[PDB]
Amino acid sequence: DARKQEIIKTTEQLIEAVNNGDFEAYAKICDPGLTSFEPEALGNLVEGMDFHRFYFENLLAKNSKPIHTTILNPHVHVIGEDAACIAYIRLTQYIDGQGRPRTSQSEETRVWHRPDGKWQNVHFHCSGAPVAPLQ
Amino acid sequence: DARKQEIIKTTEQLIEAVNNGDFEAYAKICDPGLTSFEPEALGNLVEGMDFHRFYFENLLAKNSKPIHTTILNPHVHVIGEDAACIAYIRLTQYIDGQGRPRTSQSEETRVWHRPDGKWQNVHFHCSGAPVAPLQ
Amino acid sequence: DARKQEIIKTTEQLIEAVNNGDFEAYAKICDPGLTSFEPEALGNLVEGMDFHRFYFENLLAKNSKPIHTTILNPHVHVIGEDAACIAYIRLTQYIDGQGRPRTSQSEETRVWHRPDGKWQNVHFHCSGAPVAPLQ
Amino acid sequence: DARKQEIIKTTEQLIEAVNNGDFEAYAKICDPGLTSFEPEALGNLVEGMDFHRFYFENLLAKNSKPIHTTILNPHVHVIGEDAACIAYIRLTQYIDGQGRPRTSQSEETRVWHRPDGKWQNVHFHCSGAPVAPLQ
Amino acid sequence: DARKQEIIKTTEQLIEAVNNGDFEAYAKICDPGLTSFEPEALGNLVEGMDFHRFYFENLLAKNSKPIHTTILNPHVHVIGEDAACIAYIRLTQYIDGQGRPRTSQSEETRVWHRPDGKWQNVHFHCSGAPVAPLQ
Amino acid sequence: DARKQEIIKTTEQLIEAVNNGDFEAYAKICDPGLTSFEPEALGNLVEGMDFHRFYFENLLAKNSKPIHTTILNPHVHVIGEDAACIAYIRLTQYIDGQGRPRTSQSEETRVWHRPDGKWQNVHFHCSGAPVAPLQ
Amino acid sequence: DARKQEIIKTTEQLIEAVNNGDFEAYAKICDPGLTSFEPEALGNLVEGMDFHRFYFENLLAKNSKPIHTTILNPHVHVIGEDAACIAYIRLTQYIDGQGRPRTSQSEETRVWHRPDGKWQNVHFHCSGAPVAPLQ
Amino acid sequence: DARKQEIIKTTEQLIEAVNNGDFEAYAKICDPGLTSFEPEALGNLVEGMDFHRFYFENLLAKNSKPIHTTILNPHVHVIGEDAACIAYIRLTQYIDGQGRPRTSQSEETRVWHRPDGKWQNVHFHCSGAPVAPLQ
Amino acid sequence: DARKQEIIKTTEQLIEAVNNGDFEAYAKICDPGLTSFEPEALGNLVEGMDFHRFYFENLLAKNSKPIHTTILNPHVHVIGEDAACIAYIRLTQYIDGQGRPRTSQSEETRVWHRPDGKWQNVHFHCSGAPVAPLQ
Amino acid sequence: DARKQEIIKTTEQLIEAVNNGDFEAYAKICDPGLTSFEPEALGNLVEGMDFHRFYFENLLAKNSKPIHTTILNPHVHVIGEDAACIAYIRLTQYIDGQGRPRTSQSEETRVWHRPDGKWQNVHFHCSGAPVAPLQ
Amino acid sequence: DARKQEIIKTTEQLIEAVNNGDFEAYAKICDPGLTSFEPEALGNLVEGMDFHRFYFENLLAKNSKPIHTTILNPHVHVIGEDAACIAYIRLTQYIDGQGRPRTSQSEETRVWHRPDGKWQNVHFHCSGAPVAPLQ
Amino acid sequence: DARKQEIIKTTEQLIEAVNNGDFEAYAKICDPGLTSFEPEALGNLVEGMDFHRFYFENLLAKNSKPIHTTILNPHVHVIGEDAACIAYIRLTQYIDGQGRPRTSQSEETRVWHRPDGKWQNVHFHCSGAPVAPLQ
Amino acid sequence: DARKQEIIKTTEQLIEAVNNGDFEAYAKICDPGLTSFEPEALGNLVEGMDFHRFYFENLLAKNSKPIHTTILNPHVHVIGEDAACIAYIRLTQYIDGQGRPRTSQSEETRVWHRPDGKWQNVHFHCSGAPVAPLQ
Amino acid sequence: DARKQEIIKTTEQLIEAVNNGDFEAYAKICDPGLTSFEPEALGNLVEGMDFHRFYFENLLAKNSKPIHTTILNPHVHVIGEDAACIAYIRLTQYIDGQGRPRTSQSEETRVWHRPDGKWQNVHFHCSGAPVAPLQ
C-alpha cells in the first residue's frame, strides 16, 4: 500500500519538472549514467543528460501555453527495499498553432533505484507520440 | 564483470525458447504477474501469459524456416543483489514468402527479479518491428 | 408517463450547461466518480472531472456563436425508484469559420442514479462526431 | 467486493454464448425490450432480438476457427440492490483468411437489471471494431 | 390507434411481395397511374408499372439468398377517411458475393388512397441505398 | 382542371416565402406537426419548425443576390376534397462567390391537407442538391 | 390531338427497328440524305446510311439479351401539313457482362418530312449516353 | 440556292444578338413556346424565355471583352415553303482571366418556322462546350 | 468540276491498297523520293518506302477483321495541269480485342504530281490517331 | 539549285511577318482561299484569314520579348514552273513568365502557287507545339 | 564526296554486326582501348570490350524477331587523312511481347581512327533510348 | 604526357569562357561549322553559333552568383598530330533561388582539330543535367 | 607501382569468393573482429562473421545464373609496410526473374592489415545498391 | 587504452572545426591528397579540398543557430604505430526554418595516418543524412 504511493509521488514530480522547463530540478532526479529509448532518438539507445538539455534550452524553458496531463492505469513492481519499476499510459491535452485543443497518447516505463536514501531514475522507455507536440 | 554476464545468459535463453516455440520452458522464466508493452497490443498494457500463449499455439510452434537473431550494444543496470535491467537493439534475419532473405529491427527493455534463487522476468517493453515477420 | 419526463428534463438541463460553458452548474449534476467513453479520449476510459475542465476553460467558456441542438427518438429504461438509463441521437447545427451553417450527428448513452433525493450522472458513452465542431 | 464479481461473471457468460453461436442461451440473458448502439446499425438505435438473430444464423453458428478475448480494466457501478452498469476495453485475437494471427479493439458499456431474482441485459453500446472480423 | 396499424399492415404486405418477387400480388396493391422517385431512375419521375417489371423478371424472381428488413420509427399522417401518408427508415441485412453479411439504409415515403374499399399506393419516393444490393 | 391549379398556386407561394426569408408567412403554410426528409438532416426524419428556423435566421433572411427557380413537369394526385400530393423537378439558377452563374437540381414531394378551409403542408421529401447553394 | 400521335407512332417504330437489328426496315424510314450528330462521331456531322450500317452488322444484329426503353415527356412541334419535330428524354434498362441490371439516359431530337405521303427522317441529334451500352 | 442563304442570314443575326446581350432583339426571333436542350439545363428539356433571360441580365449584357465566332460546314434541310432545319459546328475564340487567347467547340441544331411572313425559332439543341466560357 | 473528282479517285484507291495490305499496288502510287510526317516517326521527317514496308509485312498483310473508313469535307487545290493538293478529315471504325466497335479520327494532307501521264504522291502529313488501332 | 533557294526565301519572309505582328505584310503572302490544319483549331480545317487575324490583334502585335527561330533539315519538292512544297522542323527559343529561357518544337508543311508572277501560300499544316508559347 | 561515304559504310557494317549478335566481327572493328558513354552504364565512362560481351552472350546472340533501323541526317567531320567523326539520329522499329510494332529514338556520336590501313572505333556516346528494347 | 595536358588546357579555357558569359572569347575557340547534341535541343542535331548566342545574351552574361565546376576522370584519345578527343564527367556546385547550395552531373564528349596551328572545337555531345541550373 | 597491384589482387580474390558462395575461402581473408556498414544492416555497425554467413547459406551458395562485375577508378592509400586502404565504384550486370539483363551501382571502401605476412580485411563500408539483386 | 583515446580526440577536433566554419584549422587536419564518398557527390569519389571549400564559404562560415552532435558506439582499429581507422554513428540536433528542434542520423568511417609526428586524415566515407540540414 504505502510503498507504491511514493513511486507514484516521485513519477509525478519528474513529469512536472519537464512541464515547467526546470532542468536544475530534473538533473537531481536522474542518475548521471541514465539511458533512454524514445521517438526522437531514431531507434538508438541514448546515455546521459546532454541529449535532453537541448529540449530544455531550445523549447521547454521558452513555451508557456496551457497543457494538462493524465496518468492512466499505473502498474508498480517492487523489487526489494531499494528498487522499483512503474508502467503507465499518458494522455496529453494541449493547444495547437490555430488555438484549438488537441489530444495525444504515449506508453511509458520508468526504472527507479534508491542510492543514499534518495530515489533516482536509471532507465526510461517511451512509445507512441513524440515529446514535442505537433502544434 | 561476472554478474552482468548471467543477465545476458538468461536473456539469450529466453529468446531461444520463443524461437523454438517452447511454451513450457518460456513459462518457467516468467513471473505469473508479468506485464507487457508491445506492438500487437495496440497501445494497451497486457498482464499474464494467455495473450502470448495464442502466438505459441497458432504460429511459433508450427513454423520451421531458418531465422537468425543478433543482440547489439546491450546495456545492463544492476540494482543490488536481487534485481537487474537490460536494454538492447535486436536485428532479425528471416526468409519471406517468395524465399528471399529480409531484415527487421526492434528496441527492447527487460526487467529481472531473483525470488527463490532463480531469475524471473517481471516486465517487458518492445518498440519497432512486430514479433510476427511480414513474410 | 411522469417518471420518464423528469429524466428528459435533467438530460436537457445537462446539455444546456455545456452549451453555456457553465462548469459550476455542470459540476453539481455529475457524481465525483463519473466515468466516460468519448472520441477525444482515443479509446481510453476517463474518470473524474479534470479531463472535461480543460474544454470548459480553453473553449466552451470563450466561444459565443449560435448553435442549435435536437434530441431524436429518446428511449428511457427505468430500473426501480433510484436508477435510470437514457439513449438518443443528437443533431447539432452550427456556423463554420467562413460563416456557413453546418450539421453533425452523435449517438449518446447516459446512466443516472438518485442519491440524497437528487439525480446525478454516473457514466456516459458517446459515438460519431467529436464535441469540438470542425469550424 | 462480492457484488461486483457476479456482474463480471454474467458479462463473461454472455460473451462466451456469442463466441459459441448459442442463440438459445443468449436469448435467456437479454430482456425482450433490449436496445443497442453498434457499428453494424449505421448510427441507428436497434430494439429487440431479430437484428442479432441474423448474425447467429448466417455467421456465428457456422464459423469454427480459434479466437481469444481479453477484458481490460473493467469498471463497475452499483445502483442499489437490483441495478448495475459495467464498462471495459475488449481485445480480440483471431486468424485471418491467409491463416495469420491478427488483433482488434472495441469499447463496450452494458446495463443490467435484476427482475425475478435473475440478472438480465437491458441496454448495450459498442465503439471501435465491428463484431464481424475482417479475415 | 387502430386506423394507423392497418397502414403499417398494408406497407409490410407490399415490402414482402417485393422480397418474394411476387409481381402478381404487387400489381394488385398499386394504382395503374402510380408515380415514383428512386435512385435507379437517375433523377426522373417514372409513371406506371413497366419500369419495375424489369427488376421482377431479371432479378427479384430469380434470387433466393437470405435477406432481413427492419422498419424504424414509422410516422403516419391520416388525411380523413380515405387517404394516408407513411414515412420511415429502412435497414436491409443481406449476404454478399463472398458470403459475408452486410447492411444498408434508405429513407422512404408512401402515399395511400382508398378507392372501392381497398387501399392502393399512388406515389412513392426513395433516398439512400439502391434497391439492388451491391453483393 | 381548376382543382389542380390551386395546388400549384399554394406550392409556388411556399417556395417564394423561402426565397424571401419570410418565416412569418412560411409558419402559416405549415402544420405544427410537419415532418421532413432532406439532405441537411443526414438521413433522419425531422419534426416541427425549429430545424428550419435556423436557416431562416442565419442565412435566408441575410442573403440578397439574384436567384431564379423553375418547376418542371409537376404531377398532381387528388385524394378526395381535402387531400392532395404534388411531385416535381426543381432547377435553381444562382450566382457563385466569384460572381459566375451556376445551376443545380432537386426532386421534391409535398403532401397537402385542408383543415378549416385552408391548405396546409403535413409532409415533405427532398433529393439531390442541398438547399444551401455551394457559392 | 390526332396529328401528334402519329409522330409518336413513327418514332416508336424507328426505335424498335434498331432494337431488333432490322436494317431493311430502318432503311425505309430514313431519307437517303439523312444527317446526324451523335456521341460515336467525335463531334463531326455524319451524312447517309453507311456509318450506321457498321453497328447493325457488327453488333445490333448479333446481340440478343433483354433491353427495355422508356420515352419521357415528348414535346411535338407541327410545322404545317408535311413537317414535324419531336424532342424527348430516353431511359434504357439493360443487363451488364456480370448479369446485373443497369440504367442510362440520353436526350434526342428527330426531324420528320412527308414526301410521297410517307413520313421520313431527315436529321437526328443525340446527347448523353452512347448507343453501345457499357456491359 | 437563294432559299438556303436566308436561313444562314437569320442564324447569323440570332448569334450576334446573343453576343451583344440584346435581349429585346433576341425575343423577336424566338417563338414564345420555344424548347431547348443545352449543357446548362443538366439533361432537362427547358421551355420559354425566362431560363435564358438570367444569362442576359447577370452576364451577357455586362461583359465587353473581344470574342470571335466561326460557323463551319452548315447543312440546310428545306421542308416546303414555311419550314427549315440548319446544323453546324461552332468555334469560339475568347480571352481568358489572365488575358490569353483560347478556343472552344460546340455542335448546334436549329429548327425554323415561317408564321405571318417572319422566320421564328421553335426548337434548339446544343452539344460540347457550355455557353459561359471558362475564363 | 471533273478535274477535282479524279484527285478524290486516286486518294480513295491509295487508302484501299493500305486496307488490303497490297504493298505492290501501293508502291506504284508513290514517288520513290516520297517524304512523310506521321505519329509513328516521333517528330522526324521520313523519306522513301522502307519505313512503311515494315507495317505492311508485320501487320497490314496479316490482319483480317472488318474496318470502315469515311472521308469528311475534302478540300482540293489545283495548281495548273500537273499538280494538286487534297486535305480532309478521316474517321475509322474498327473492332477491338474484346470484339467491341470503336472510332478514331485523323487529319491528313496529300500532295500529288503528274509525271509521264500518271498521278503519283510526293509528300504526306498526318495528325491525330496513329495508323495502328489500339485494339 | 537556284529555284529551291527562293522557296526558302519566301518561307523565311512569311515567318518574320508573324514574329513582327505585321498583318498587312502577311495578308499579301496568302491566297484569300487559304486553308489550314493547326493545334488551335481542335482538329477542324479552317479557311480564310479571320481565324488568324484574332492572334495578330490580341497577341502578336502586343508582345515584345526576345524570340529566336531555327529551320532544320528543309526538304523542297518542285512541281513544274508554278508550284512548290516545303517541309521542315521548327525550333523556337523564348523567355517564360519568370524570365527563364525555354525551347519548343513543331513540324510544318507549306504549299506554294505562282499566280501573276508572285508566290502565294494556298495550304498549311502544323503538328507539335501550339503557336502561343506557354510562358 | 568519296571519303565521307566510306565512313558511312563502316558505320553501317558496325550496326549490322550488333543486330546479328556477331561478336567476332564486332571485336575486329573496335580498338582494344575503346571508351563508351551509354544509358546502361548509369552515367559512368566504360572502357574495353567485356561490358558489351554480356549483352552479346545473354541477349543479342539469342533473340531472332524482325527489327528495322534507319540512320537520319548523318553529319561527317574529316580531320586529315587518318581521323573522322560521325553524328546521326537512329530510329528502331521492333515487335513487342504482344506482337505489336513499336518505334524508339537515340542520338549517337562515333569517333574513327585509321591505324595500319584499317578504320577502327576509339570512342562512342549514346543518348535517348536504351539498346535493350522494352518488349 | 605533354600532348594530353594541352587538350586539358584548351578544354578548361572553353568552360571558363561560358562561366564568364564571354561570347567573344568563346567564338574564337569554335569552328564556324560546329555541331552539337545537348538536352536543350530536344533530340535534334544543331549546327553553328546562333542557338548558343541566345543563352549568352539572355542568361550567362546577366547572372553573377558563385558557381564551382569539377572535371572528373578525363580520358584523352590522340589521333595523329592534328586531332584529339576528350571525354569526362562534370560536377557543378551552385546556389538556388532560396540561397541553398546544390549539385548536378553531366557526361561530355569534345572533338578537337588543329587548323592553322590553333586548336578549335568541331563537335560536342552532352548527357544528364541541362546547362541552365534549376535554381 | 608493385605494392598497389597486390591490394587490387586481394580485393579481386575477395569479390570472387562471394560470387562463388565460397564461405571457407572468404573466412580466411577476414579478421575475426571485422566490422561492417552496409544497406542490409539498417544503419547499424555489425561485427564478426555470422551476419554474413546467413547470405552464404540461404542465397549465395544456392544461386547459379550469370553475373559480371566491374571495378571502376580504384584509388589506393598505402600507410607504411603493413596497412592499406582501397576505394572504388562497383558495377554489377545480372539477369532478372523474367530473363532480362539489368545493371546496378555501389560505392565501397575496404581497410587491409598485414598480420603474420598475410593480408586480412578489418573494416568494410558500402553505399548504393543492396548485395541481393532485385531480380 | 591510451592510444584509442587520441584517435577519438582528433576526430572530435575535426567535427568542431566544421561546426565553427574554421576552414584554416580544417585544412591542417587533412592530407592534400584526401579522397571522399558522401551524399552531395552523387555517387562519385571526390579528391582534394576545393569541393568542401564551397560549403565553408557559402554556408558553414555564415550560419549561427544552435546545433548539438553525439558520437555513438565508436569502434577503433589500430594498424601498427602510424595508422588507425574509426567508425561510428552520428546524431545531429538542429533548429528548422520555423524554429522547431529536429534530429538526423549518419554513418561515418575515417582513416588516419601519422606523417611527421602529426595525425592527418587520408580518406572519408559517409552514409545517411546530407551534411546540409533540411531546415
Side-chain angles (χ1 to χ4, degrees), chain J residues 13-89:
Chain J
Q13 288 169 327
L14 189 166
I15 290 160
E16 194 70 342
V18 182
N19 292 334
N20 295 344
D22 189 1
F23 190 72
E24 299 97 303
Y26 181 81
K28 295 172 183 178
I29 291 170
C30 302
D31 185 304
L34 169 67
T35 52
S36 183
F37 284 130
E38 65 206 292
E40 288 73 15
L42 307 176
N44 303 277
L45 189 79
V46 165
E47 183 177 8
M49 306 302 293
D50 292 324
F51 188 88
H52 304 102
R53 193 198 299 266
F54 183 89
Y55 296 99
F56 280 82
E57 290 184 335
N58 298 93
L59 180 66
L60 303 166
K62 298 184 66 179
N63 281 11
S64 63
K65 279 188 300 191
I67 288 184
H68 186 63
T69 298
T70 304
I71 293 174
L72 293 179
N73 317 313
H75 197 292
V76 181
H77 300 273
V78 182
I79 315 161
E81 302 301 325
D82 296 341
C85 181
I86 188 173
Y88 59 91
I89 290 166

Side-chain angles (χ1 to χ4, degrees), chain C residues 33-35 37 42-45 47 73 75 77-80 82-89 105 107-109 111-114 122-127, chain D residues 33-35 37 42-45 47 73 75 77-80 82-89 105 107-109 111-114 122-127:
Chain C
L34 169 67
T35 52
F37 284 130
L42 307 176
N44 303 277
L45 189 79
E47 183 177 8
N73 317 313
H75 197 292
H77 300 273
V78 182
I79 315 161
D82 296 341
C85 181
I86 188 173
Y88 59 91
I89 290 166
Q105 177 181 328
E107 299 83 54
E108 300 187 2
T109 298
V111 190
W112 290 96
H113 188 218
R114 201 185 183 176
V122 305
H123 183 66
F124 165 61
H125 195 161
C126 187
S127 300
Chain D
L34 169 67
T35 52
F37 284 130
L42 307 176
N44 303 277
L45 189 79
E47 183 177 8
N73 317 313
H75 197 292
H77 300 273
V78 182
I79 315 161
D82 296 341
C85 181
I86 188 173
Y88 59 91
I89 290 166
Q105 177 181 328
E107 299 83 54
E108 300 187 2
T109 298
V111 190
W112 290 96
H113 188 218
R114 201 185 183 176
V122 305
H123 183 66
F124 165 61
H125 195 161
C126 187
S127 300

Side-chain angles (χ1 to χ4, degrees), chain G residues 17-28:
Chain G
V18 182
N19 292 334
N20 295 344
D22 189 1
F23 190 72
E24 299 97 303
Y26 182 81
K28 295 172 183 178

Side-chain angles (χ1 to χ4, degrees), chain L residues 20 26 29 42 54 56 58 68-71 74 92 107 110 123:
Chain L
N20 295 344
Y26 182 81
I29 291 170
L42 307 176
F54 183 89
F56 280 82
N58 298 93
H68 186 63
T69 298
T70 304
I71 293 174
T92 305
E107 299 83 54
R110 294 182 192 273
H123 183 66

Side-chain angles (χ1 to χ4, degrees), chain F residues 19 63-69 92-95 133 135, chain H residues 54 58:
Chain F
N19 292 334
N63 281 11
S64 63
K65 279 188 300 191
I67 288 184
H68 186 63
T69 298
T92 305
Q93 291 179 299
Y94 64 94
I95 297 297
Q135 300 185 6
Chain H
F54 183 89
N58 298 93

